[PDB]
Design a protein around this ligand. Structure first.
Ligand SMILES: Nc1c(O)cccc1C(=O)O
Ligand SMILES: Nc1c(O)cccc1C(=O)O
Ligand SMILES: [Fe+2]
Ligand SMILES: [Fe+2]
Ligand SMILES: [Fe+2]
Ligand SMILES: [Fe+2]
Lengths: 170, 170
């Protein structure tokens, strides 16, 4: 048993409640596994949309959150009310908002094989055009992602909309 | 959204409680998805060990169950007490026992690519040698599996231990 014995999940969540809040906000259950199993807390808001080449499974265990999405070309909102499960198809752009303190969502995805890339995108609040997109070989979420986001926030050139010139707030 | 909107999971489980019991016993949440998401009920006991080439994630939502396993070469038992989560590494032989009526376990695995095969095994209760093993390209669980099991139960030749001659009960 490379990942240990079964264990009580609510107890696990309580014991890590101090990570399920800012600044870290999320914690991965098992390490070096093909299934990436994460518990995400709150509060947290973000402006980035994730373009994940594989599926994402959500189970909102405690509290509520929601997913800003793009569907057919429209800004839509998928609610994760407490007790909801959701399976997100590949490449559906999504920006999870987790406003509630003390909330917990089980998120399961899997390791991306070599050459299968994740995208992170920002759209313009004014005209809705794509503002900036970074493709990344996601090997470690908590590690390849903060500095990527920091560079977008720190460059007005990246935040500048190619269509209307509005500078995204970051 | 190829798999629909979020939805309340406890409600879903209640509404399918009549499938989470014999003869069917389990129900898959979404169809034609890369993540195979299943809710397994009870009661059910079985003698087969599954050799799955990919990981299996368990979350025992209601009631209790357990997993007979082989580890290093020993018969071991992994308990799924209500509220336990568990991640099973690939190829660890496992035979889930689900004795409790009205129980529910979330089981998540993924579609096997072409040429990656599942194995199903039976061991001898007397000397512990391997008695019979079928490799299968698992494309649909509820479909390729009953007739496979029916053939093992129906053939004393398959149940006959190569080491000691005891005929497995099936
Ligand atoms: N967007 C997410 C991700 O890509 C991995 C784990 C969690 C989330 C999230 O819902 O916050
Ligand atoms: N062994 C299982 C499997 O291979 C798929 C879904 C459920 C189970 C189970 O735990 O009963
Ligand atoms: Fe994502
Ligand atoms: Fe714009
Ligand atoms: Fe299995
Ligand atoms: Fe035997």
């Amino acid at each position: 048993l490379t990942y240990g014995a079964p264990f009580n999940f609510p107890r696990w969540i309580d014991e890590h409640a101090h990570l399920l809040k800012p600044p870290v906000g999320n914690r991965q259950v098992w390490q070096d596994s093909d299934f990436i199993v994460t518990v995400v807390g709150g509060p947290n808001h973000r402006t980035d949309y994730h373009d994940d080449p594989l599926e994402e499974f959500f189970y909102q265990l405690r509290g509520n959150a929601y997913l800003n999405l793009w569907v057919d070309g429209r800004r839509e909102r998928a609610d994760l009310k407490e007790g909801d499960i959701f399976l997100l198809p590949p490449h559906v752009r999504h920006s999870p908002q987790r406003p509630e303190a003390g909330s917990a969502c089980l998120v399961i995805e899997r390791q991306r094989p070599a050459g299968m890339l994740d995208g992170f995108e920002w759209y313009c609040d004014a005209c809705g055009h794509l503002v900036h997109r970074v493709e990344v070989q996601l090997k470690s979420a908590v590690t390849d992602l903060p500095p990527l986001f920091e560079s977008f926030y720190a460059s007005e050139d990246k935040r500048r909309c190619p269509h209307c010139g509005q500078v995204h707030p970051g």
